[PDB]
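Why do we bother with holo predictions? Because pocket geometry can differ from the apo form. Keep that in mind while you read this record for zinc ion.
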Amino acid sequence: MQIFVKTLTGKTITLVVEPSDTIENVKAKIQDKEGIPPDQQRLIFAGKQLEDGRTLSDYNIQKESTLHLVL
Ligand SMILES: [Zn+2]
Ligand SMILES: [Zn+2]
Ligand SMILES: [Zn+2]
Ligand SMILES: [Zn+2]
Ligand SMILES: [Zn+2]
Ligand SMILES: [Zn+2]
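The structure, written out:
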């Protein structure tokens, strides 16, 4: 399972994840790829604001889904 995270510039980050991964897990992976602090990251999927403690599968994030980093 992989997902795509688009940064505020439109750069695509591809991440290996599992259904149970938390959004906090995802933020850590983004920090490692791009150096963006987790406290500065806000993620959306299908217009939903994603909370650190919930999982990909809680939000129906699927293989090949795209998330956005937002302000
Ligand atoms: Zn797979
Ligand atoms: Zn596992
Ligand atoms: Zn994981
Ligand atoms: Zn794991
Ligand atoms: Zn900070
Ligand atoms: Zn989009």
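The first strand starts at residue 2 and ends at 6.
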